[PDB]
Each structure stands twice: as C-alpha cells, then as structure tokens.
C-alpha cells in the first residue's frame with residue numbers, strides 16, 4: 618500500500634520536449650537509463666521516504682583494500698542516499714582495521730569478518746567496489762528490483778567490441794550477435810530478493826566453469842553480464858555512476874561524475 622504524495626510544486630514535464638537528446642534514456646524493454654536531467658529527485662525522495670525505505674550498501678575490503686574504507690565511507694556519508702535509512706555492510710578479514718567513521722542519523726555500519734539477515738534488515742542491496750569515492754549525488758533514483766551500470770569504457774562501443782566471455786565452453790558465454798550493454802561488475806543492485814537470485818546464479822555458474830576447468834575472461838563481471846542479458850535489469854545506470862576521470866576525462870555527455878575510481 619502506497620500512501621498519497623503531498624502537494625508539490627515543480628516544473629511541468631513537457632511531452633514535446635525530450636529530457637536528453639544526446640543519449641538513450643530508456644532501454645528496448647522499457648527500463649529507464651538513469652542520466653542527470655531525467656529525474657526530479659524531490660518526487661522520488663518523497664516516494665521512497667513514504668515507504669521508509671532502507672538501503673543496504675555492501676563492500677568487500679580484504680588485505681590492502683582496507684585502506685580504501687575511510688574515503689569510501691566518508692564520501693558515502695555526503696552523497697549516498699542522504700536522508701534515507703542506510704545500513705553499510707563491510708566484509709573484511711581485518712575487523713579492527715575498519716576506520717572509525719562518523720555517521721549521520723539513521724545510518725548504521727556492520728562489520729562482517731570473512732544472508733537471511735539482509736532480507737529482514739534492508740529493502741534494497743547495492744553492491745560496489747571499495748576502491749572508489751562518491752563525488753556527487755547517488756540516491757533513490759537508482760532503486761528498482763534489479764539494476765546494472767554501464768561500464769565507462771564501453772557505453773559507446775558496438776557489441777562485438779564488448780569484452781564478454783566468448784568461449785562456448787563457459788557458462789558466461791555470449792556470442793558476438795548478442796548483448797545489450799556491457800555492465801561493470803563494480804556497481805549493481807536491486808531488491809534483496811533479486812540480488813540474491815543474481816549472486817546465487819553467478820555462484821552456481823562459476824562452480825560449473827571451475828569444474829570444467831575454465832575461468833571467464835573477466836570473472837564475476839563476465840557472469841554478471843550473462844545474467845543481465847538473460848534477466849533484463851529494470852533500470853540501467855549511466856556512466857555517471859561509475860567513472861574514472863584520470864583514464865577517461867570528462868565528456869560533455871556526463872553532467873555529473875557521481876561515483877569514481879580512486880587511483
């Protein structure tokens with residue numbers, strides 16, 4: 618049951634005036650592709666707050682990568698789902714090495730040393746790489762049953778150029794005449810149910826390959842791409858959500874750089 622939205626005053630959307638004329642904002646299966654200018658965050662914030670949405674953010678920090686946690690968490694505090702309930706889950710082999718970061722109200726952090734827990738604790742799960750930092754808003758506009766993010770290096774490439782696993786012997790195999798986009802394994806998510814379905818599928822697919830003595834060219838990412846090809850994401854995030862300015866600069870097509878790689 619969704620309660621009614623309150624009166625709100627904002628610019629009227631114009632039917633005969635496209636959001637962006639420089640990019641595709643909807644996939645062929647009618648899933649929005651999230652770019653700055655396509656969403657009114659005030660409307661979306663209202664919609665998700667009225668549902669008291671809790672977002673879980675999961676990151677793995679093993680070995681030397683624990684050194685990336687401080688900047689990651691501090692910037693997440695300034696840009697990730699601000700205003701909403703957030704639960705960080707840090708999986709690490711060095712619990713005592715997790716930095717003491719100050720969190721805003723309604724936000725929590727759990728350290729798990731290396732999940733039915735997720736189902737009862739959060740509504741959505743966002744899975745990202747830790748060697749990153751948030752530079753701009755990353756909010757509820759990304760929430761949906763299942764989403765993938767366009768890899769910053771292939772958003773303008775043709776499918777035959779996509780670095781999918783091309784060996785038929787692999788469960789992640791995708792022929793050159795197939796493929797919608799090349800999603801990066803560093804940022805995906807959705808409802809807890811859909812994310813667990815995805816991870817379960819990939820885990821099983823990888824075990825099969827291992828048994829057959831083969832390892833997908835880009836490991837987890839290869840399987841993620843196979844999964845999202847066969848199970849279309851309900852939203853696709855633009856490269857604004859996964860960029861590397863040192864390697865790729867700042868094209869005009871990107872009005873904001875929200876989540877970026879840390880050298």
Ligand SMILES: CC(=O)N[C@@H]1[C@@H](O[C@@H]2O[C@H](CO)[C@H](O)[C@H](O)[C@H]2O[C@@H]2O[C@@H](C)[C@@H](O)[C@@H](O)[C@@H]2O)[C@H](O)[C@@H](CO)O[C@H]1O
Pocket residue numbers: 768769770771780801802835838861864878
């Ligand atoms: C710079 C880098 O080491 N490699 C660049 C490629 O980026 C990698 O792409 C593969 C899939 O083809 C994987 O997704 C891999 O994780 C990517 O590297 C990671 O992400 C990039 C954006 C960088 O941040 C890198 O440091 C990081 O390890 C890229 O696809 C190609 C084409 O642009 O260039 C390579 O230099």
Ligand SMILES: O=c1ccn([C@@H]2O[C@H](COP(=O)(O)OP(=O)(O)O)[C@@H](O)[C@H]2O)c(=O)[nH]1
Pocket residue numbers: 676677678679680681682745746747748803
């Ligand atoms: O020694 C490692 C290597 C990787 N990772 C985790 O695995 C993710 C992906 O690895 P990496 O970022 O090195 O891949 P890349 O972005 O270079 O393709 C990292 O962000 C961490 O979350 C880790 O915890 N310890």
Ligand SMILES: [Cl-]
Pocket residue numbers: 675676744745746802803
């Ligand atoms: Cl992840």
Ligand SMILES: [Hg+2]
Pocket residue numbers: 635636637654655656
């Ligand atoms: Hg628009």
Ligand SMILES: [Hg+2]
Pocket residue numbers: 675742743744812
């Ligand atoms: Hg996850």
Ligand SMILES: [Hg+2]
Pocket residue numbers: 675676677743744745
């Ligand atoms: Hg994760």
Ligand SMILES: [Hg+2]
Pocket residue numbers: 815818819820822840841843844
């Ligand atoms: Hg998979």
Ligand SMILES: [Hg+2]
Pocket residue numbers: 816819820823837840
């Ligand atoms: Hg996997």
Ligand SMILES: [Hg+2]
Pocket residue numbers: 815816819837838840841844
């Ligand atoms: Hg996967």
Ligand SMILES: [Mn+2]
Pocket residue numbers: 746747748803
């Ligand atoms: Mn990374």
